[PDB]
Write a protein that binds this ligand. Structure first.
Ligand SMILES: OC[C@H]1O[C@@H](O[C@H]2[C@H](O)[C@H](O)[C@H](O[C@H]3[C@H](O)[C@H](O)[C@H](O[C@H]4[C@H](O)[C@H](O)[C@H](O[C@H]5[C@H](O)[C@H](O)[C@H](O[C@H]6[C@H](O)[C@H](O)[C@@H](O)O[C@@H]6CO)O[C@@H]5CO)O[C@@H]4CO)O[C@@H]3CO)O[C@@H]2CO)[C@@H](O)[C@@H](O)[C@@H]1O
Ligand SMILES: [Ca+2]
Length: 183
């Protein structure tokens, strides 16, 4: 009985993704919409140009979007049960990089972590070829807890943190969905 919120970038825009608060991007140096992953029925993705410093065990940056672009809006999560996303990292360059990275998916209403993973390296997830290039692909859904299935501050945050990584390159996000489907 609820309509999924589908952040697929298919309008050719960043769909309000950018800093979550002033100067939050940090290791994320640029946020843009890209056709690098263009393929049947999926023309655009969110490109995050990142730089991690290998001497830092937690080289953090925070990317936010407001649902509907409404800054400080609230969104009724009643009936929504998961947040799903796909993440893509060029395989060859990532494999050559040292260390790894962590990510978190958060609803920023008192900072509520939905899920996270640590020590991601190139052999995480699945290796997929898109436009002549291999990618590490992470595709997950995290639960929205029952106590958040109500009106909450409508900022979704993706945190990235280099963990002694020297990776300098893109990370892509696509198909970020707030879904009634269970995680
Ligand atoms: O705009 C309105 C209002 O906003 C205010 O800004 C807010 C902002 O919107 C947001 O809500 C922010 O929330 C904070 C939050 O309160 C809390 O501090 C949170 O901390 C996170 C942090 O971001 C990281 O995710 C951190 O990760 C740790 C890992 O979980 C793990 O423990 C890790 O372990 C490492 C270890 O460090 C070491 O390398 C080794 O031992 O290996 C381990 C890994 O195996 O360490 C990580 C780093 O600590 O987790 C913590 C939670 O525990 O961060 C968010 C985001 O900043 O709050 C602000 C307010 O402060 C204001 O601007 C206000 O004026 C505005 O009106
Ligand atoms: Ca897309």
């Amino acid at each position: 009985s609820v309509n999924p919120v589908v952040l697929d970038f298919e309008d050719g825009t960043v769909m309000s993704f950018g800093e979550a608060w002033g100067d939050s991007l940090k290791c994320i140096k640029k946020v843009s919409v890209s056709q690098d992953l263009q393929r049947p029925g999926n023309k655009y993705a969110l490109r995050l140009d990142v730089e991690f410093n290998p001497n830092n065990g937690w080289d953090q940056g925070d990317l936010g979007t407001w649902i509907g672009g409404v800054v400080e809006g609230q969104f009724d999560f009643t009936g929504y049960k998961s947040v799903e996303f796909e993440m893509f990292i060029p395989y060859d360059e990532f494999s050559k990089s040292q260390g790894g990275f962590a990510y978190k998916v958060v609803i920023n209403d008192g900072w509520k972590e939905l899920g996270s993973e640590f020590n991601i390296t190139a052999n995480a997830g699945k290796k997929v070829k898109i436009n002549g290039k291999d990618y590490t692909v992470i595709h997950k859904a995290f639960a929205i807890p029952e106590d958040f299935r109500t009106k909450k501050r409508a900022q979704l945050v993706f945190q990235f943190a280099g963990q002694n990584s020297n990776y300098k390159g893109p990370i892509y996000l696509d198909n970020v969905r707030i879904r009634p489907e269970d995680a």
